[PDB]
């Protein structure tokens, strides 16, 4: 019943920092590993120290060093903290090939070591970003190997969705297009969120006009914990990760369920307001709490999964579902009946001490696969196209051995993906 | 004379958690395993569900099956999880994930061999089995998937024993798995012809009853599964305890099945009303019959007056006159003659037990076989077709080797049950 | 009437350490040597295994043999190492090193003369020997190598006494010595025709039982050898103590050997389950027979239902009815008739003792002679051949003078036992 | 039940220093010999002083003087400390012949004296190095005599394997080739380790980038103690030295089992990590812990012996074996079934105070005979060849009476040895 977390790149690792901090908060784990009390994620020592079963990869020492100098440096095993010396430079060509390919063997052997520590490997999940060099480059490299060795294990990916308006990486389209090509075909499911959309959540629901990544990742951590800690904890409907895959992936392509999370409420907003299960789920179908800037009303739904924490009575859930099925404007694709996965954990929602979110007594996470995602690809299509037509920055990949045909090909694979969304949109 | 029960799937395991609790209540058996009752009858027929182990320990004759230790553990952690022996916990590791193919066709299939071995060990421990009962969900992976596989093998080993099962039927509003109708379709395809009878439980209907007549605003599944266990326990106790009428499960099966393929049941239960009104209720046979006939007191989301009634069983617990029961059943038949099928004269049959359920003076269990049942099949079949055309999640299933033509035949078979209900609906 | 036991090899010495412990438990004999029991029977038949020395000291009639003082010392250092007299510790200096050639053929051969002299001294100390028993490993140097040599000489001196031995058979997974199959092959070559019977113990199977039914996660060899001693002690106590049936070792041997060469046994034991379930177990004769028949409760890594059963002995300890035992054995014969050999009518034989093992109400020892045994021989023979062709470590053996043609004949002889099992497998 | 250690050359003696220090650590032996408490190695005096039954040979006073001035100078008997005045000069021709042959008679008589002190000589073992003058020269000289007098006793040799990359001895190939010729034929078994490989172990498992020989020999000492102290101590499966020979040497040639040792873990690496028997043995089949730079995956296995310390339950061992037999890529030679010797001592693993290795509760030593060793010989073949073709440095041997034919011959003997490995590799 075990799983592995993999943190690649800054985004992967810094999100991971929040994630493991939250898992410590879930059980009262001390920075040194001492836990007085979740062995699905952790491995126990004779001292009662538990080791989070995870791998941290950075090709630049700095971020891992940040871990190594922080409080959780005692928690993590030195072998889990893997670092190279040089970067990918925002570039798949080095991340996947030239540079990252050198260290990956080590990385894999640490993974395999942990796989041998697992007794019942259920699977794993990889945290990264769609635009970066290691964030997406190295990441797909890893998938290429992990899908061989662990072909039957859960291969869930979580990635930051490139913001349409702000991006620090000029060749991000190129990176992301190459990842599509290689991740679609290897991964089982990839989830993503938009930091821009999140900013809007922070300013509207948390009332914060100063979000940093350390805020943004707390919110992400919430979502992740709902599906990682609480799915291993007790509930009414205990849903596994393999079950998630088995209930969220409808086609052999990928699919890309997007996250939505409600409650996201400031402490003051929690006052004077009573949420019910149904009210929280109402919020879950509002564009306003959509974690990716993509309009839910534009597309049609294919999948939807609702996962519940704390004070949730199935009775209320059932009523809530009835209304979301019938009251809303949620259009859905023919193919699908509304079999929405309901996970119901008794495990209460948790809050980070010193965080922004209010203590809540119940909480709902929503995953959804909508046809509007093709528009996200359309965004990438043109951004890629523009650059590629001019061949701007192309020498930074070509010099590492990339082929122009390959890039065209990858775009075409994306186009095919868009076409399949088109297909799904056609009802039948 | 004895029965073996097997629970499977998270649903089945949690239902059984309440079922066994009740059975031990009925007999005064402590959560730790020993007998601390106080009635002769409490031990007298205990054999049907318990083995007395050395030390005056009673072992529930049941197997708990799952593919995730954690659910099993949670069961074990409560009272009455200690009464089960470790040997009755048969489980694997890695879920099923609510996947029929995994459950039945592939992975869960692997576990079934160990389950069956224990089944065999228990079949030997019994003197003479009357039958077997299984608890599960129709749209679940281990509940239906693995469970079905097991049933086909048990039936094979014991053609001469009763094979029945109670199962949670996907409610119109709350499906959890997107392909829940697919799993259900496949289970019909396998179960119907590999079972003597199956009961149809709808959670939605149950949630309506709990608020509608019981006026409760906090139930959980444990409270609703209490109601489920009331009907299950109602059936077997009579068989166990002294009564007036004819207290044999097989005879029940004989009286309720007019045709080899149409064996689906609508359970209902009386009395079943809130405490407020309990000060304004009278306890008579007509009172129970009013609650029994009323469709709102059915646990299945069907409407018996929409369809036609093929067979009705009225089981009574506690001291009642024979006359009164006879007359009221007749009256029911008379007044609701428009719903009964004309081919069966006196279509309402009774069974009477003189032991009341603990805490009540009287009670009654409604078991029906109407044509209305077909409506559930119709809903599923339709939903199925849509999914079938799109292959939603079928890559998971076909990825594990499930072939679409098998599913095609499953669809037909669903439609066949509907057509046969039409054939006897007239 | 008396028995002499000789232990050899590190295995044999450690097994015997538990065996004798148990025997003294059975009779209330203190680790220091005196009798402090409390039952008449405890002293009454003590003669079979103990000499009472002046002062009411009991001397175990056994010889401890090794070629390294340190193992002997460790035995001596514990309780019950003090009950053995110094004269029963016969050992040399410099190992054997798990080398048959050294053990049997050369160096260990030298020690055997001193061992035998002590054997003779004890044979005189007895009034009338029933037989001898030896404990050893089949793939070990002193266990099998030297031990075998000793056996050939004892048999020579006493053709009319029972010669049996219990031996650890190389488990498929854990061999220690690279040529462990070689040593085993050579021991078959020598032992089979120089013994009346031999028992086949597989440590792997034992480790499965200890976790499988006993649910234990810490055993050591002392815990597994406890199980071994349970079977050994089970056999001889009946012979010692009052019973109902026929309590003579030779008679056991007669009933279990249909053919001069096929005398290999599969020991098993009941009851043998974890404490948790002990609150859910019932103690009946069928209960013991269920545990006895079940292959998983065998201590040999064989599968009796794969082969055919030639002979079965069921030994019972404690008060049981004759009827029940007779009927259940018959039932076994009936239901498992497909495994029994048709040439022997009523192939299941019984023996009954009225004394239960300390702490239990009842117990049973399973002894079988199936054809399934041949599978172990086949595994060894095959492995042997490969090594034979390469002469792995045979320079050590040929260096000590062991000739390859002798080994060739040994190989044949293994194959002969297999063919004879086939000849009676039919 | 007694044995003799022989320390020839610096390498032999300095390793010995660590070894006897460890034996003192095993029982609490004071530098003066006072032991308050292993007489298989030691000889007792009426003062309760025990003398380690060993001979120290150096033809240059200095190293023995180092012993004579250290703390253990009180431990060793002055007659055990044998020294000449002049060296072999890296040269077999002087080590075996011209110089060492003069003192050897003394040396032998001290050995014989100790042999007479032994009551049950089980055997002995010789510590040296394959490249040096006394390290290999004198060493083989000794074997020539010891194999006569003690023909039936254990003749185990331990030698440093010449590092392929760093060697301080230009005629080391020549020395080692001559030793092959003379040791193969006389010795029973020779074990060897590569200081370069060890450095990699120190830097990867101990995390030390500054290993000196005094570190390197501690690690060697660990391995040796597992087979020397703990094999005389109590266990489940008490394995003797003669048993080792009887379980490790498959052919009358030599054979050369290589050492592997796992656990080799820094204190910090021990934290947060729980080793089992099985996990330690997993590490034992990893190239990464291979004490000789030779790839385990290249060759095929012929022999393998696993020796256990501390908290080892045979139950777990059995399971571990099952997986190494079936899970691994360990190819093995036909000839051999997998009868791997399992020695199981209850005696716990010991750690040197102030050392680098972490306190462990259980430990496993692995000996293995792989066909990849022929590549090691191939290395020597060419190194020898190059020198010999040019006849570089040849006058340093010729002037001492060496013959060129002899050198050719010795190479040919090595070639024959390689051919026999070839033979074994051919499965049959
Ligand atoms: N939510 C979130 N997004 C982040 C975080 N850090 C970076 N990102 C986003 O991820 C992308 C940045 O990737 P980089 O940090 O440039 O690169 P990398 O993927 O770590 O790998 P390299 O390019 O080789 O350094 C941008 O789109 C950022 O907006 C973080 O902590 N949280
Ligand atoms: N592990 C280990 N290797 C050593 C040690 N000392 C030397 N060596 C190695 O052994 C070889 C050195 O042998 P030398 O010290 O030159 O010579 P010797 O064998 O003592 O004999 P002479 O040549 O006559 O001085 C080199 O390959 C060294 O790397 C030591 O303390 N430990
Ligand atoms: N009455 C009832 N239904 C349940 C319970 N648990 C799950 N269910 C129903 O079972 C279906 C889900 O299948 P599930 O039991 O999770 O499948 P499995 O666990 O993979 O075999 C849904 O329709 C739920 O309403 C329960 O404890 N009581
Ligand atoms: N059951 C059991 N087997 C043992 C014991 N000791 C060694 N063995 C087995 O004996 C074989 C090894 O032979 P060994 O007894 O060392 O030979 P010897 O000591 O040279 O005669 C292996 O198959 C071990 O599993 C023990 O105490 N109990
Ligand atoms: Mg970076
Ligand atoms: Mg020197």
- DSSP characters over A235-282: EEE---HHHHHHHH--SSS-B-PEEEEE---BHHHHTT----HHHHHH
Q: Are residues C107 and C127 in the same domain?
A: yes
> Is position D243 annotated as part of the catalytic site?
yes
Task: Tell me, letter by letter, the H, E, C secondary structure of D146-209.
Answer: HHHHCCCCEEEEEEEECCCCCCCCCCHHHHHHHHHHHHCCCCCEEEEEEHHHHHHHHHHCCCCC
Q: How many helices (H) and strands (E) does chain A have?
A: 15, 13
Q: Are residues B202 and B351 in the same domain?
A: no
Residue D392 makes CB contacts below 8 A (sequence gap 6+) with none
Among D64, D66, D132, the mutation site with the greatest number of ligand 2 atoms within 8 A of its Cβ is: D132
> Which CATH number goes with the domain that contains B343?
3.30.1330.20
Q: Tokens representing C282? A: 């019932």
B248 burial level (CB within 10 Å; 0-12, 13-18, 19+): middle
* Residue D224: closest CA among D160, D148, D153: D160
Query: What is the distance in A from the centroid of ligand 2 to the CA of D173?
Result: 14
Find out whether C329 and C337 touch, Cβ atoms under 8 Å: no
Q: Are residues B252 and B290 in the same domain?
A: no
Q: Are residues C190 and C142 in the same domain?
A: yes
Q: Do chains B and C touch (3 or more CB pairs under 8 A)?
A: yes
Cα B377 from Cα C368, distance rounded (Å): 56
Q: Are residues B172 and B123 in the same domain?
A: yes
Residue of chain A with shortest Cα separation from B73: A234
Chain centre to alpha carbon of residue D325 = 26
Q: Which long-range contacts (CB under 8 A, 24 or more apart) does A394-399 make?
A: A396/A89, A396/A91, A396/A93, A396/A171, A397/A91, A397/A92, A397/A93, A397/A171, A397/A174, A399/A93
Q: Are residues B345 and B393 in the same domain?
A: no
Find out whether A156 and A189 touch, Cβ atoms under 8 Å: yes
Neighbours of B78 (CB within 10 A): 11
> Could you give the C-alpha distances from D136 to D63, D141, D194, D414, in angstroms and in order?
17, 9, 16, 16
Find out whether A219 and A202 touch, Cβ atoms under 8 Å: yes
- Characterize the bridge pairing of strands D50-52 and B162-168: unpaired
Q: Do chains C and D touch (3 or more CB pairs under 8 A)?
A: yes
Q: Write down how long chain B is.
A: 426
Give the residue numbers spanning the domain of C345. Answer: 259-372
> Could you give the C-alpha distances from B257 to B252, B303, D19, in angstroms and in order?
9, 19, 86
Q: Are residues C238 and C318 in the same domain?
A: no
Q: Are residues C128 and C271 in the same domain?
A: no
Cα C86 from Cα A339, distance rounded (Å): 80
Residue where the block lists tokens 């056994």:
C62
DSSP state of C141: I
Across the interface, of A46, A76, A78, the residue whose CB is closest to D274 is: A46
Find out whether D358 and D406 touch, Cβ atoms under 8 Å: no
> Could you give the C-alpha distances from C2 to C133, C160, C237, D59, in angstroms and in order?
11, 13, 12, 67
Cα D253 from Cα A206, distance rounded (Å): 79
* Residue C411: closest CA among C194, C177, C187, C185: C185
Find out whether C98 and D247 touch, Cβ atoms under 8 Å: yes
Three-state secondary structure call for residue A81: strand
Question: What are the DSSP calls for A54-76, one per residue?
Answer: EEEEESSHHHHHHHHTSGGGTTS
DSSP state of C34: B
- Cβ of B87 within 8 Å of Cβ of C282? The answer is no
Find out whether C68 and D240 touch, Cβ atoms under 8 Å: yes
> Which CATH number goes with the domain that contains C391?
1.10.287.600
- Characterize the bridge pairing of strands C264-270 and C197-201: parallel
Cα D205 from Cα B375, distance rounded (Å): 68
Chain centre to alpha carbon of residue A85 = 26
Find out whether B374 and B422 touch, Cβ atoms under 8 Å: yes
Residue of chain D with shortest Cα separation from A45: D274
Cα C177 from Cα C175, distance rounded (Å): 6
Among B372, B387, B410, the domain-final residue is: B372
Across the interface, of C279, C286, C290, the residue whose CB is closest to B57 is: C279
Cα A115 from Cα A124, distance rounded (Å): 10
C78 burial level (CB within 10 Å; 0-12, 13-18, 19+): exposed
Write out chain D residues lying below 8 Å of A78, CB-based.
Answer: 207, 268-269
Q: Tokens representing C66? A: 């090794």
CA-nearest residue for atom 12, ligand 4, is C140
Find out whether D351 and D357 touch, Cβ atoms under 8 Å: yes
Cα C413 from Cα C407, distance rounded (Å): 10
Q: Does A247 carry a binding-site annotation?
A: no
Q: Are residues C145 and C236 in the same domain?
A: yes
Nearest-atom index, ligand 3, CA of B142 = 21
Q: Tokens representing B180? A: 């829940």
- Characterize the bridge pairing of strands A235-237 and D235-237: unpaired
- Cβ of C282 within 8 Å of Cβ of B124? The answer is no
Nearest-atom index, ligand 4, CA of C15 = 27
Helix (H) or strand (E) segment spanning residue C424 = helix C404-425
* Residue B366: closest CA among B245, B222, B269: B269
DSSP state of A427: -
Three-state secondary structure call for residue C92: coil
Cα C95 from Cα C73, distance rounded (Å): 14
DSSP state of B324: H
Write out chain A residues lying below 8 Å of B207, CB-based.
Answer: 315, 318
Helix (H) or strand (E) segment spanning residue C53 = strand C50-53
Neighbours of A186 (CB within 10 A): 17
Q: Are residues C157 and C271 in the same domain?
A: no
Distance from the Cα of A40 to chain D's closest Cα (Å) equals 15
A90 lines ligand 1 (CB under 6 A): yes
Q: C65 has which bridge partners? A: C8, C90
- Cβ of C278 within 8 Å of Cβ of B52? The answer is no
Resolution in Å equals 5.3
- Cβ of B177 within 8 Å of Cβ of A321? The answer is no
Residue D210 makes CB contacts below 8 A (sequence gap 6+) with none
Find out whether C80 and C105 touch, Cβ atoms under 8 Å: no
Write out chain D residues lying below 8 Å of C386, CB-based.
Answer: 334-337
Residue where the block lists tokens 């199981």:
D344
Helix (H) or strand (E) segment spanning residue C187 = helix C180-191
- Indicate if the alpha-carbon torsion angle B113, B114, B117, B118 is positive or negative: negative
DSSP state of C140: -
Q: Tokens representing C324? A: 């029940």
Cα C136 from Cα D13, distance rounded (Å): 43
Which amino acids of C are annotated as binding site, given as ranges?
10, 68, 137, 141-143, 203, 225
DSSP state of C29: B
Q: Tokens representing A314? A: 């199935």
Q: B367 has which bridge partners? A: B267, B313
Residue D249 makes CB contacts below 8 A (sequence gap 6+) with C393, C395, C396, D188, D189, D255, D303
> Could you give the C-alpha distances from C238 to A355, C58, C233, C234, C351, in angstroms and in order?
76, 20, 9, 7, 8
Q: Tokens representing D346? A: 């209850």
Q: Tokens representing D210? A: 């500054």
CA-nearest residue for atom 9, ligand 4, is C11
Q: Are residues B241 and B305 in the same domain?
A: no
Q: C352 has which bridge partners? A: C316
Q: Does B141 carry a binding-site annotation?
A: yes
Find out whether B353 and B303 touch, Cβ atoms under 8 Å: no
Across the interface, of B99, B210, B389, the residue whose CB is closest to A246 is: B99
User: Which of D257, D337, D338, D425 is the best residue to mutate to test the C interface, defined by the most C CB atoms within 10 Å of its own CB?
Assistant: D337
Among D84, D89, D91, D135, the mutation site with the greatest number of ligand 2 atoms within 8 A of its Cβ is: D135
Cα B353 from Cα A34, distance rounded (Å): 60
Find out whether B256 and B344 touch, Cβ atoms under 8 Å: no
Find out whether D363 and D263 touch, Cβ atoms under 8 Å: yes
Helix (H) or strand (E) segment spanning residue C208 = helix C203-212
Find out whether B265 and B200 touch, Cβ atoms under 8 Å: yes
Nearest-atom index, ligand 4, CA of C146 = 21
Exposure string of B90-110, with b = 16+ CB inside 10 Å and e = fewer, is bbbbbbbbbbbbbbbbbbbbe
Residue B243 makes CB contacts below 8 A (sequence gap 6+) with B351, B352, B353, B354, B355
- Indicate if the alpha-carbon torsion angle C16, C18, C21, C23 is positive or negative: negative
Q: Tokens representing B373? A: 């049942």
Helix (H) or strand (E) segment spanning residue B374 = helix B374-390
- Indicate if the alpha-carbon torsion angle B348, B351, B354, B356 is positive or negative: negative
Q: What's the alpha-carbon Rg for chain B, to the nearest Å?
A: 21
> Which CATH number goes with the domain that contains B242?
3.40.50.1440
Angle at D281 between CA D280 and CA D283, to 5 degrees: 65
* Residue C141: closest CA among C369, C328, C336, C393: C393
How many Cα atoms sit within 13 Å of A257 on the Cβ side?
23
Catalytic residue among D66, D144, D196, D243: D243
Among C196, C226, C258, the domain-final residue is: C258
Q: Are residues B414 and B327 in the same domain?
A: no
Q: A396 has which bridge partners? A: none
Q: A83 has which bridge partners? A: A58
Three-state secondary structure call for residue A34: strand
Question: What are the DSSP calls for B167-178, one per residue?
Answer: EEPPPSS---ST
Cα C313 from Cα A358, distance rounded (Å): 73
What domain count does chain C have?
3
- Cβ of D340 within 8 Å of Cβ of C393? The answer is no
> Chains meeting C at 3+ CB pairs closer than 8 A?
B, D
Determine contact: B86 vs chain C, CB below 8 A.
Answer: yes
Q: Tokens representing A221? A: 């951590």
Neighbours of C44 (CB within 10 A): 12
Cα A419 from Cα A374, distance rounded (Å): 8
Catalytic residue among A243, A400, A404, A422: A243
Across the interface, of B55, B121, B124, the residue whose CB is closest to C279 is: B55
Cα B143 from Cα B67, distance rounded (Å): 10
Q: Tokens representing C303? A: 């599968």
Among C258, C276, C310, the domain-final residue is: C258
> Could you give the C-alpha distances from C112 to C59, C63, C88, in angstroms and in order?
22, 12, 13
């Amino acid at each position: 019943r075990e799983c592995i977390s993999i943190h690649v790149g800054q985004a992967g690792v810094q999100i991971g920092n929040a994630c493991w901090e939250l898992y410590c908060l879930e059980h009262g784990i001390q920075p040194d590993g001492q836990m007085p009390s979740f062995n699905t994620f952790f491995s126990e020592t004779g001292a009662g120290k538990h080791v989070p079963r995870a791998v941290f990869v950075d090709l630049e020492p700095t971020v891992i060093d940040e871990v190594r100098t922080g409080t959780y440096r005692q928690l993590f095993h030195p072998e889990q903290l893997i670092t190279g010396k040089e970067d990918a430079a925002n570039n798949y060509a080095r991340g996947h090939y030239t540079i990252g390919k050198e260290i990956i063997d080590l990385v894999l052997d640490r993974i395999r070591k942990l796989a041998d520590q697992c007794t019942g490997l259920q699977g794993f999940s990889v945290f990264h970003s769609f635009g970066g060099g290691t964030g997406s480059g190295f990441t797909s490299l890893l998938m290429e190997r992990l899908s061989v060795d662990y072909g039957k294990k859960s291969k869930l990916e979580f990635s930051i969705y490139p913001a349409p308006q702000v991006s620090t990486a000029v060749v991000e389209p190129y990176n992301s297009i190459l990842t599509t090509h290689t991740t679609l075909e290897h991964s089982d499911c990839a989830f993503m969120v938009d930091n821009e959309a999140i900013y809007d959540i922070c300013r509207r629901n948390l009332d914060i006009e100063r979000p940093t990544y350390t805020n943004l990742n707390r919110l992400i951590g919430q979502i992740v914990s709902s599906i990682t800690a609480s799915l291993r904890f007790d509930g009414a409907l205990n849903v596994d990760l393999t079950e998630f895959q088995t209930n969220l992936v409808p086609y052999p392509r990928g699919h890309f369920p997007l996250a939505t999370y409600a409650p996201v409420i400031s402490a003051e907003k929690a006052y004077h307001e009573q949420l019910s299960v149904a009210e929280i789920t109402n919020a879950c179908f509002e564009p306003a709490n959509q974690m990716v800037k993509c309009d839910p009303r534009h597309g049609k739904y294919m999948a939807c999964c609702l996962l519940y924490r704390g004070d949730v009575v199935p009775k209320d859930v059932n009523a809530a579902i009835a209304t979301i099925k019938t009251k809303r404007t949620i259009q859905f694709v023919d193919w699908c009946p509304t079999g929405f996965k309901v996970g119901i954990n008794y495990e209460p929602p948790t809050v980070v001490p010193g965080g922004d979110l209010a203590k809540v007594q119940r909480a709902v996470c929503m995953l959804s696969n909508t046809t509007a995602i093709a528009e996200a690809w359309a965004r990438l299509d043109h951004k890629f196209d523009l650059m590629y037509a001019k061949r701007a920055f192309v020498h930074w990949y070509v010099g590492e051995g990339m082929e122009e045909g390959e890039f065209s090909e990858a775009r075409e694979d994306m186009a095919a993906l868009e076409k399949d969304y088109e297909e799904v949109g056609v009802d039948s | 004379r004895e029965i073996v029960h097997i629970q499977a799937g998270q649903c089945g395991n949690q239902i059984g958690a309440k079922f066994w609790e009740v059975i031990s209540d009925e007999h005064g058996i402590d959560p730790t395993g020993s007998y601390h009752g106080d009635s002769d009858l409490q031990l007298e027929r205990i054999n049907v569900y318990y083995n007395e182990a050395a030390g005056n320990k009673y072992v529930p004759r049941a197997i708990l099956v799952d593919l995730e230790p954690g659910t099993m553990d949670s069961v074990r952690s409560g009272p009455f999880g200690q009464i089960f022996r470790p040997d009755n916990f048969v489980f694997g590791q890695s879920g099923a994930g609510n996947n029929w193919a995994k459950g039945h066709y592939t992975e869960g299939a692997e576990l079934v061999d160990s389950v069956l071995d224990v089944v065999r060990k228990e079949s030997e421990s019994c003197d003479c089995l009357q039958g077997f009962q299984l608890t599960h969900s129709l749209g679940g992976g281990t509940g239906s998937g693995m469970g079905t596989l097991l049933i086909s093998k048990i039936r094979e080993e014991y053609p001469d024993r009763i094979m029945n099962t109670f199962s949670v039927v996907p409610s119109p509003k709350v499906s959890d798995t997107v392909v829940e109708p697919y799993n259900a379709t496949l289970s019909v395809h396998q179960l119907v012809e590999n079972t003597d009878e199956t009961y149809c439980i709808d959670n939605e209907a149950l949630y309506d009853i709990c608020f509608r007549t019981l006026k409760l605003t906090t139930p959980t599944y444990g409270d609703l599964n209490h109601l489920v266990s009331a009907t299950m326990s109602g059936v077997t106790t009579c068989l166990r305890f002294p009564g007036q009428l004819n207290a044999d499960l097989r005879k029940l099966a004989v009286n309720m099945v007019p045709f080899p393929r149409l064996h689906f049941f609508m359970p209902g239960f009386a009395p079943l009303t809130s405490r407020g009104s309990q000060q304004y209720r009278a306890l008579t046979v007509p009172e129970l019959t009013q609650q029994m006939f009323d469709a709102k007191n059915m646990m299945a989301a069907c409407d018996p007056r929409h369809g036609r009634y093929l067979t009705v069983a009225a089981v009574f617990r506690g001291r009642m006159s024979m006359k009164e029961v006879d007359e009221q059943m007749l009256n029911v038949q008379n007044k609701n003659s428009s719903y009964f099928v004309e081919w069966i004269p006196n279509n309402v049959k009774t069974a009477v037990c003189d032991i009341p359920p603990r805490g009540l003076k009287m009670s009654a269990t409604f078991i029906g076989n109407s044509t209305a049942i077909q409506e559930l099949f119709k809903r599923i079949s339709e939903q199925f077709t849509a999914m079938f055309r799109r292959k939603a999640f079928l890559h998971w299933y076909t990825g594990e080797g499930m072939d679409e033509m098998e599913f095609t035949e499953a669809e037909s078979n669903m439609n066949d049950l509907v057509s046969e209900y039409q054939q006897y609906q007239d």
